[PDB]
Design an enzyme around this catalytic site. Structure first.
Site, PDB file in Angstrom:
ATOM      1  N   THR A  96      22.770 -29.448 -39.933  1.00  0.00           N
ATOM      2  CA  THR A  96      22.317 -28.823 -41.231  1.00  0.00           C
ATOM      3  C   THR A  96      21.216 -27.757 -41.233  1.00  0.00           C
ATOM      4  O   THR A  96      20.356 -27.722 -40.354  1.00  0.00           O
ATOM      5  CB  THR A  96      21.763 -29.936 -42.131  1.00  0.00           C
ATOM      6  OG1 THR A  96      22.804 -30.837 -42.361  1.00  0.00           O
ATOM      7  CG2 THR A  96      21.307 -29.504 -43.527  1.00  0.00           C
ATOM      8  N   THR A  97      21.279 -26.892 -42.243  1.00  0.00           N
ATOM      9  CA  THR A  97      20.141 -26.103 -42.689  1.00  0.00           C
ATOM     10  C   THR A  97      20.024 -26.203 -44.209  1.00  0.00           C
ATOM     11  O   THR A  97      21.005 -26.002 -44.929  1.00  0.00           O
ATOM     12  CB  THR A  97      20.286 -24.622 -42.306  1.00  0.00           C
ATOM     13  OG1 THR A  97      20.617 -24.512 -40.916  1.00  0.00           O
ATOM     14  CG2 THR A  97      18.987 -23.869 -42.580  1.00  0.00           C
TER      15      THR A  97
ATOM     16  N   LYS B 290      25.438 -31.025 -49.986  1.00  0.00           N
ATOM     17  CA  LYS B 290      24.129 -31.489 -49.510  1.00  0.00           C
ATOM     18  C   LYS B 290      23.045 -31.405 -50.580  1.00  0.00           C
ATOM     19  O   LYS B 290      21.856 -31.557 -50.287  1.00  0.00           O
ATOM     20  CB  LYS B 290      23.706 -30.692 -48.278  1.00  0.00           C
ATOM     21  CG  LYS B 290      24.553 -31.012 -47.068  1.00  0.00           C
ATOM     22  CD  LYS B 290      24.224 -30.099 -45.910  1.00  0.00           C
ATOM     23  CE  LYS B 290      25.199 -30.327 -44.777  1.00  0.00           C
ATOM     24  NZ  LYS B 290      24.987 -29.362 -43.677  1.00  0.00           N
TER      25      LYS B 290
ATOM     26  N   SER C  97      18.588 -28.736 -38.464  1.00  0.00           N
ATOM     27  CA  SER C  97      18.687 -28.139 -37.130  1.00  0.00           C
ATOM     28  C   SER C  97      18.471 -26.624 -37.110  1.00  0.00           C
ATOM     29  O   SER C  97      18.047 -26.076 -36.092  1.00  0.00           O
ATOM     30  CB  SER C  97      20.051 -28.466 -36.510  1.00  0.00           C
ATOM     31  OG  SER C  97      21.105 -28.200 -37.423  1.00  0.00           O
TER      32      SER C  97
END
Ligand SMILES: *[C@@]([C])([C][O])[C@](*)(=O)[C]([C]C1=[C][C]=[C][C]=[C]1)[N]C(=O)[C]([C]C1=[C][N]C2=C1[C]=[C][C]=[C]2)[N]C(=O)[C]([C])[N]C(=O)C1=C([C])C2=C([C]1)[C]=[C][C]=[C]2
Ligand SMILES: [Mg+2]
Ligand SMILES: [Mg+2]
Ligand SMILES: [Mg+2]
Ligand SMILES: [Mg+2]
Ligand SMILES: [Mg+2]
Ligand SMILES: [Mg+2]
Lengths: 233, 204, 211, 226, 195, 196, 222, 195, 196
Positions: free
Chosen positions: C1-2, C33, C130
């Site tokens: 993820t970001t 998300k 990440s």
């Protein structure tokens, strides 16, 4: 969590046209030591079910008592205990399967592999497997331990799928089982020559055969085998 | 840590009718970090093509090694090496490092100049040859490629049809792999003409 | 993820990617998300998917009960603290959850970073996952308080794109949100594949990449 | 992998399945596991596939040179001795498990060989992940004084047991028959019981479906004259 | 050591390298030059395990200087980078590998082009417009992806580099004590004394 | 494995089972563990089959070369070659070998060479995983200067019990008789020895 | 040491149509390199027009299904025989899974049915309860083999319209049940070829407003 | 967190605490206030494992505030420090200890004296003229040993504190993003906004 | 340890060595391993001395309480109590117990309870580290319905061999005879049994 101590090897079984057959040798091994030679690992429950158990013998004896107590409890306040409300193979299996999965979920398993063979009220064949992990499956042929690797291939040549079951007689099925037990005696280092065999038929009922031996063995060709390569004498 | 999945990348080869195709992604990474989108994994020695996946330093090293060996082969034999022969050379060269191997998944592709027969082959990092008729896959998305190739592939495809099949196998396999993508190249190979096509794909 | 989120003159922007992984395998191309806790509260998700979904939906239960008891919407500060307190109960039990609680309350726009350690931080700008380092690069060099709603939305969008490109475990699509005093506003799902080529041409960026 | 070896009246037969795997994935659906050491000495290997090939080619090469040196046809005991001494030297690190069979001026021979360098003698043998399924068949049906036709049947039946019941084995059955006073007959794909059924749909794409950025001609020819 | 950056602009290559050197919990030096001139138009920066970095760089320097004297000729940046890669690829399978990552910035006088090569300790070579080693790229590549053009001037390259260092100084936990910046162009190698 | 060698009036007899296991799987049920290193010098092998075969092959080579130069070697000499290999390579070997041979001068002799590479000359010896179960039986029933028939019965009864209790032992009972008369191979099948 | 987990192999596949849904799975059950059963049902009709499959460790999968079937039963008792919608079932299953966050059900779970507007629905889970509604999902051993194929053939990914050259995508036309079943059968035939844990048989459960229908197809037994 | 310093001068206690907060490789915040007011004349700074620090500090704050309301009286710095020590000594033998180190700076209104207490996570209490936790003391105590007098003014205390931070900024590898300084005296607690 | 229990015509006899070791040191050379849980129900203990003593003490308590309520317990009942303790506490126990008793109805009975907590009724049983060496001897020499003197000789010869080969076994041979006549203790010293 434990480790198995005194152990029983393969239990093998198969369906045929009018019922099921199950077999298991009479040995209780203590590692590589062939310690106990009079151990019964097929345990009948009523006149319609036989439970075959491999793995830890102390846990087998515990299960043996659970089943004996199950029959007692079913008879309590039950006028139809020997008729309509008698114990079925499916009831006995699901009970054991419930127990096995609960014990593994508490990280304290019964170190066994179990095959419940029997015939239901409606004459249907019952054959299902359960083990220490609570894993369950059913098949026309079922076998535990080494039997899975060596017996199933032989028994599946007789009953390869569901449609082969009505075409298979009790004489053919028994013959296949007995041959499989011989093969296991040749090749399983924790097996014995002595074994027990049980047939549950929808017509003739429960036939329990004790003190069976593996016979018609081939050893003569051993005399000709010499050395490990180049040796002639 | 796993050398075969540090840099990422994929290679796939297919046979067609009087033709072969070999394709690769262009990514080079340091695990999660993308480093290069121009790291081509396919090389050619004359008319024999070699795609290499795995650890990038060994990919580069092996290319330089097979260039070295095929250039000497040609000087002595007075002819270019053929795919069947090169395949054995790759296998020999990898097994000589049996207990200190190159962490790679090579793939050979080409057409025999004499017989005209299309040829592909794959290897494990230690030299075992997989001489398949249909297709060969290698890389971090090898499972994905097996699934795509096995369903999309049909024998005796024409060059311009084979192009679409191999491209779609690569593209969609790469799009389900974190360590593959960032561009792609496809070689379409015929007995005396070779076309190279860069594909447009998502850059994430 | 970001994920990212930042305060500005006209509220707060929240932007997330949509990838999910299981090792090198991309297990999902389009996961949501962001959680819509209430019309004025958002929650971003990074880390263990299950943990993110369970605990942020449990936060929504607890934020709803606050409204029923008090007849008034919970503050961003209080909501973030309830969540951080949940994390402290399962302290050291192995949860993995990084989140930003974004919203508008009586103190104006609010933004809190909360993680599985029970950390609770107030601030104008955050990014988790990440690929947060890639997003921070674009945010830090382009962020102002005086941003227009249009320019702010683009910044969060462009910052995720930067991370999606470089980070192998970030990508798929971009989900945009804009929080105002009348509530959050969803600004769509944007495929990174299409967005990349669009941004490349219009902006002139990603010169090294060929297209 | 499932491989077997069976002796009969006037020779020996070996057989094998044709599946090679990398973990749970099938890499090659028609791999050739029956290797040639010399014309009338054939080998089949389980374990590390590269090792079984390399060790077979190496010993086969040395056996050929030995045959030329001695002006004699190669013996199976020579291949056996050379293999076990090589494998023993590498202490099991060369993961080659082989069934070796052949005919020579001494007669017909059948040996098994394990990666650490131990050898065995037998009238019927099996190796690989499907060895137990295959051995169950061999122990059920093998007898003394088999004919060529009975032995091929027994061998292929044993391989089929492995194909159907072992997940590490599958696809086709390869056979090689080595009879005394005859050329060895290699029967590639002797049985083919696992043909893939026709697919329900064709996935051939429309030309132009894939997006392209650049095209270019690749120069594979050498530098030209003039 | 910690951070080494590289960027190739229109007519030059710019290398930025941190000044810090740390033993234990103490910063021993804040003016360390993590670079060696391999030839008049080829500069190599380096980062990795203590001691190995300088030993490797000086060993490479000696070999290139030996080549220059023997042939009375400067090797191309591409040739030098390939030589360095082979030494690292040779090293990784040695008893004790040299744990060194390098950037090679050179100006090719034949082609009249600047060239930047990134090589890690495994021997992984890539030619790039801009590059970094370790964690440096995690913070800086997003800025470079955004702002970089191939027709940039040296002055614009330095401004983009300042932005990269500012981002590092903001978001990195470690204090790397600023950077020494060096420019490689047609006229040779020079150091930017004020940065 | 269950192996033994017994001296008697006319010479010596070696005996062994025929089972080889890989865990609980019986890889070979008709193994020949009685191996010849010289005309009338044989050995029984226990431990790693790879190690014991490699050793016995080297010993056979040494004794063949000894014979070419110096004539027929003694049983003691054969045991020394075994020992030298087992002792000097003890770190990399797992071999338990019983050596048995017949001379006209020395008659029947038995040497045992356990794991460490020590040598022990004995009237009779037992070894292998199955030997543990017959230490008591063999000690009680062994006599010196038995007849051939008595010695065959002793080995048969002994290995019968070893096979009965040890899962790693089984199959047929092979025997080799070493006397002035020559070399006689014997075999005894399950139906014979199980009913003892 | 006792390992409470195991791997029974198998692979499952769910596809959502416009007014229908399918949930398919192979019937092979395995441990290591052995076959336990060639026909061991893995996809179940749980009632209320919902089908479910928990693939991975069979013991945990059977337990989950058994528990959800029980949850449906008690939903009827407690809420006046109200029909459990697919979205409500999905949320319920999330809580069943997360109840074991620290000793997980080792399964990849998929359910299929129809939403409250009558459209086809598929929901996908991870072992610890994260879920979401999806159009297409393959789960289990050969999930990585099958999913890319579905991205290509169901959602028309990387497929463009000829002549435009990458400028215009292939339009997302809906699929019929006959077309979907073809993609399912080809997906499993392909998976059976390249994956050793996949084979023996294929059982497909199709969900429409009319009810739940079953279709069985043989697979390779090697 | 990283660095917390404390110094007791003539008529006040000064606490300096770093502003950095780091998760993974990213500095999430550079303005974090690692302190809680326990009472009007008692301030506690803290440093240790993530999450535990704030939870512990707020738990202590709540207990002291509860005491203040119940008795309508401010506990002495000594009493508060003893309460805090016991909680940490109780904590160290718990199933999961709170990994927190603290400095307690307070002005005792009864005795008209500033007081500084250093307490580590084990429950190790010491009253000191100046103190620190972790590696901070390794760099700073030599300066404090040299320059410290008990009759120092608040302004001289701040100047000596600046010298300590400058030394940390020079010789520490980690960037702690400066410090927030707070002064505790007879008039209460105030923050030095320019440092 | 070397322990055994043997049924015969008139009842049952328990036998045991007297050696207790801590590694290679003999902590006690005159141990009494034949322990009474009831008048004519005795047991032989092997494994952890702490565990086996604690168990036998608990069993003795249970059978004393059984007797107070329900009268004289059977040997089977005694074995069940042992089993229940050994089985349910198998994770924390290392106990190998042989149970032997005499009824007038059931006569002499022998039950063995190995490590796991399983129960096995047998004509005779052997256990302990030294039992391994006499599996072959005991199997060959045991008969049903032996006389008292024959049974004493059988146990004496058997344990003699176990002691001879097992270093963990030794000292004196203790025996307990359980018949209708009563309870007879026997002892046999090294000079008697070593020369057998
Ligand atoms: C980045 C994409 C990867 O780090 C991001 O952090 C996401 C966040 C996320 C938040 C909400 C929903 C989905 C994703 N994380 C993941 O995708 C994580 C990364 C991860 C794997 N193991 C692990 C992780 C993180 C921390 C500890 C351990 N991935 C997962 O949690 C995996 C297990 N999720 C799935 O496989 C999911 C599937 C399949 C699926 C999901 C999640 C949700 C809905 C349908 C299907
Ligand atoms: Mg990708
Ligand atoms: Mg990405
Ligand atoms: Mg690199
Ligand atoms: Mg060895
Ligand atoms: Mg035996
Ligand atoms: Mg298959």
């Amino acid at each position: 969590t434990q480790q198995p101590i005194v152990t029983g090897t393969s239990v093998i079984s198969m369906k045929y046209d009018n019922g099921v057959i199950i077999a298991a040798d009479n040995l209780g091994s203590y590692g590589s030591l062939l310690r106990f030679n009079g151990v019964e690992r097929l345990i009948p429950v009523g006149d319609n079910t036989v439970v075959g158990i491999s793995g830890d013998i102390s846990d087998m004896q515990h299960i043996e008592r659970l089943l004996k107590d199950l029959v007692t409890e079913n008879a309590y306040d039950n006028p139809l205990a020997d008729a309509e409300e008698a114990l079925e193979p499916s009831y006995i299996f699901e009970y054991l399967a419930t127990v096995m999965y609960q014990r593994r979920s508490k990280m304290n398993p019964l170190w066994n592999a179990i095959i419940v063979a029997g015939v239901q009220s409606n004459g249907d064949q019952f054959l299902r497997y359960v083990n220490l992990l609570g894993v369950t499956y059913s098949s026309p042929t079922l076998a535990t331990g080494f039997g899975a690797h060596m017996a199933n291939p032989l028994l599946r040549k007789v009953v390869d799928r569901e449609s082969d079951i009505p075409k298979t007689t009790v004489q053919v099925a028994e013959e296949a089982i007995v041959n499989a037990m011989r093969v296991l005696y040749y090749r399983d280092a924790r097996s014995s020559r002595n074994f027990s065999l049980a047939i549950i038929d929808k017509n003739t009922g429960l036939t329990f055969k004790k003190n069976l031996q593996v016979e018609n063995m081939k050893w003569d060709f051993a005399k000709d085998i010499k050395g490990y390569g180049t040796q002639k004498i | 840590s796993d050398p075969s999945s540090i840099n990422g990348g994929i290679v796939v080869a297919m046979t067609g009718k009087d033709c072969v195709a070999i394709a690769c992604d262009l990514r080079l990474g340091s695990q999660s970090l993308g480093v290069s989108n121009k790291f081509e994994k396919i090389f050619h020695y004359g008319h024999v093509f070699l795609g290499i996946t795995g650890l990038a330093t060994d990919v580069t090293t092996l290319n330089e090694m097979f260039r070295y060996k095929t250039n000497l082969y040609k000087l002595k034999e007075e002819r270019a090496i053929e795919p069947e022969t090169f395949t054995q050379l790759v296998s020999s060269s990898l097994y000589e490092r049996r207990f200190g191997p190159y962490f790679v998944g090579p793939v050979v592709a080409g057409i025999n100049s004499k017989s005209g027969k299309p040829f592909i082959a794959g290897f494990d990092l230690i030299g075992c040859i997989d001489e398949a008729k249909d297709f060969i896959v290698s890389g971090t998305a090898s499972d994905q490629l097996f699934g795509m190739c096995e369903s999309l592939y049909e024998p005796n495809l024409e060059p311009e049809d084979l192009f679409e099949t191999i491209s779609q196998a690569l593209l969609n396999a790469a799009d389900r792999d974190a360590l593959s993508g960032w561009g792609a190249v496809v070689y379409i190979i015929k007995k005396d003409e070779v076309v190279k096509r860069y594909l447009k794909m998502r850059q994430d | 993820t970001t994920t990212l989120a930042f305060k500005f003159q006209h509220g707060v922007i929240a932007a997330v990617d949509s990838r999910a992984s299981a090792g090198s395998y991309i297990s999902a191309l389009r996961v949501n998300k962001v959680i819509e806790i209430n019309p004025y509260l958002l929650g971003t998700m990074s880390g263990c998917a299950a943990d993110c979904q369970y605990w942020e939906r449990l936060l929504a239960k607890e934020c709803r009960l606050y409204y029923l008891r008090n007849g008034e919407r919970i503050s961003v500060s209080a909501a973030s603290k309830l969540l951080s307190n949940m994390m402290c109960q399962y302290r050291g039990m192995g949860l993995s959850m990084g989140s930003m609680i974004c919203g508008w309350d009586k103190k104006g726009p609010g933004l809190y970073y909360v993680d599985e350690h029970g950390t609770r931080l107030s601030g104008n700008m955050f990014s988790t996952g990440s690929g947060n380092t890639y997003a921070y690069g674009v945010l830090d060099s382009n962020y102002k308080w005086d941003l227009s709603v249009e320019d702010a939305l683009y910044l969060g969008k462009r910052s995720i794109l930067a991370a999606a490109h470089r980070d192998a475990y970030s990508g798929g699509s971009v989900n945009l949100y804009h929080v105002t005093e009348d509530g959050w506003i969803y600004h769509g799902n944007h495929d990174v594949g299409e967005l990349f080529w669009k941004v490349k041409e219009e902006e002139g960026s990603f010169n090294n990449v060929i297209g | 992998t499932t491989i077997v070896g069976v002796k009969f009246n006037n020779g020996v037969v070996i057989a094998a399945d044709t599946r090679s795997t990398q973990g749970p994935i099938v890499a090659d659906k028609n791999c050739a596991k029956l290797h040639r050491i010399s014309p009338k000495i054939w080998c089949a290997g389980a374990g590390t596939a590269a090792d079984t090939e390399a060790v077979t080619q190496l010993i086969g090469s040395n056996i050929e040179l030995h045959s030329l040196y001695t002006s004699r046809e190669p013996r199976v005991v020579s291949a056996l001795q050379m293999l076990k001494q090589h494998l023993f030297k590498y202490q099991g690190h060369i993961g080659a498990y082989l069934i070796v069979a052949g005919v020579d001026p001494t007669g017909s021979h059948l040996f098994s060989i394990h990666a650490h360098g131990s050898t065995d003698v037998g009238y019927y043998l099996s190796l690989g992940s499907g060895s137990l399924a295959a051995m169950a068949v061999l122990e059920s049906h093998w007898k003394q004084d088999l004919t060529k036709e009975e032995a091929i049947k027994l061998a292929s039946d044993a391989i089929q047991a492995g194909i159907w019941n072992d997940l590490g084995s599958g696809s086709n059955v390869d056979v090689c028959v080595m009879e005394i006073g005859k050329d060895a007959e290699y029967l590639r794909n002797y049985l083919t019981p696992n043909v893939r059924e026709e697919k329900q749909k064709s996935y051939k794409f429309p030309r132009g479906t894939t997006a392209v950025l650049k095209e270019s001609i690749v120069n594979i020819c050498d530098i030209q004259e003039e | 050591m910690d951070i080494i950056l590289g960027i190739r602009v229109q007519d030059s290559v710019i290398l930025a390298s941190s000044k810090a050197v740390t033993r234990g919990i103490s910063v021993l030096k804040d003016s360390d030059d993590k670079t060696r001139q391999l030839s008049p138009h080829t500069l190599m920066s380096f980062a990795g395990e203590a001691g190995d970095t300088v030993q490797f760089a000086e060993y490479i320097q000696a070999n290139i200087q030996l080549y220059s004297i023997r042939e009375d000729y400067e090797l191309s940046p591409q040739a030098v980078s390939s030589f360095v890669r082979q030494e690292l690829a040779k090293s990784i399978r040695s008893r004790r590998p040299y744990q060194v990552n390098v950037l090679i910035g050179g100006y090719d006088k034949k082609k009249n082009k600047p060239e930047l090569y990134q090589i890690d300790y495994l021997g992984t070579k890539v030619e790039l417009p801009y590059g970094a080693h370790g964690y440096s790229g995690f913070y800086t590549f997003s800025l470079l992806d955004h702002h970089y053009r191939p027709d940039m001037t040296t002055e614009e390259g330095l401004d983009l580099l300042k932005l990269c260092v500012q981002e590092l100084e903001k978001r990195m936990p470690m204090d790397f004590k600023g950077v020494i910046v060096k420019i490689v162009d047609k006229d040779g190698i020079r150091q930017v004394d004020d940065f | 494995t269950s192996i033994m060698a017994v001296t008697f009036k006319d010479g010596v007899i070696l005996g062994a089972d025929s089972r080889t296991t890989t865990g609980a799987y019986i890889a070979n049920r008709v193994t020949d563990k009685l191996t010849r290193v010289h005309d009338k010098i044989w050995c029984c092998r226990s431990g790693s089959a790879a190690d014991t075969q490699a050793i016995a092959d080297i010993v056979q080579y040494h004794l063949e070369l000894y014979t070419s130069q110096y004539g027929t070697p003694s049983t003691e000499t054969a045991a020394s070659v075994f020992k030298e290999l087992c002792y000097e390579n003890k770190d990399n070997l797992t071999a338990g070998i019983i050596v048995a041979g017949y001379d006209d001068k020395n008659k029947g002799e038995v040497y045992t060479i356990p794991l460490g590479g020590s040598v022990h000359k004995l009237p009779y010896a037992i070894a292998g995983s199955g030997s543990t179960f017959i230490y008591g039986y063999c000690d009680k029933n062994f006599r010196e200067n038995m007849s051939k028939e008595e010695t065959v019965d002793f080995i048969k009864h002994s290995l019968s019990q070893a096979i009965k209790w040890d899962g790693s032992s089984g199959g047929v009972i092979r025997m080799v008789v070493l006397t002035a008369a020559g070399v006689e191979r014997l075999i005894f099948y399950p139906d014979e020895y199980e009913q003892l | 040491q006792f390992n409470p987990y195991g791997d029974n192999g198998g692979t499952i596949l769910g596809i959502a149509g416009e007014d229908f849904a399918v949930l398919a799975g192979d019937t092979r059950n395995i441990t290591d390199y052995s076959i336990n059963s060639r026909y061991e049902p893995k996809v179940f009709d749980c009632g209320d027009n919902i089908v479910m499959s928990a693939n991975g460790f069979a013991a945990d999968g059977d337990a989950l299904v058994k528990r959800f079937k029980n949850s449906v039963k008690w939903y009827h008792f407690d809420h006046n025989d109200k029909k459990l919608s697919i979205n409500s079932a999905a949320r319920n299953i999330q809580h069943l899974l997360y109840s074991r966050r620290f000793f997980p059900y080792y399964v990849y779970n998929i359910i299929a049915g129809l939403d409250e507007d009558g459209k086809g629905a598929v929901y996908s889970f991870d072992p610890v309860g994260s879920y979401q509604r999806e159009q297409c999902r393959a789960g289990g051993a050969a999930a990585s083999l099958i999913m890319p194929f579905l991205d290509n053939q169901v959602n028309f990914k990387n497929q463009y319209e000829p002549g435009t050259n990458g400028k215009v995508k292939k339009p997302l036309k809906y699929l019929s049940v006959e077309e979907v079943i073809k993609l399912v059968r080809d997906s499993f035939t392909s998976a059976t070829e390249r994956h050793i844990q996949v084979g023996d048989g294929l059982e497909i459960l199709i969900v429409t407003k009319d009810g739940v229908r079953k279709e069985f197809y043989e697979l390779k037994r090697d």
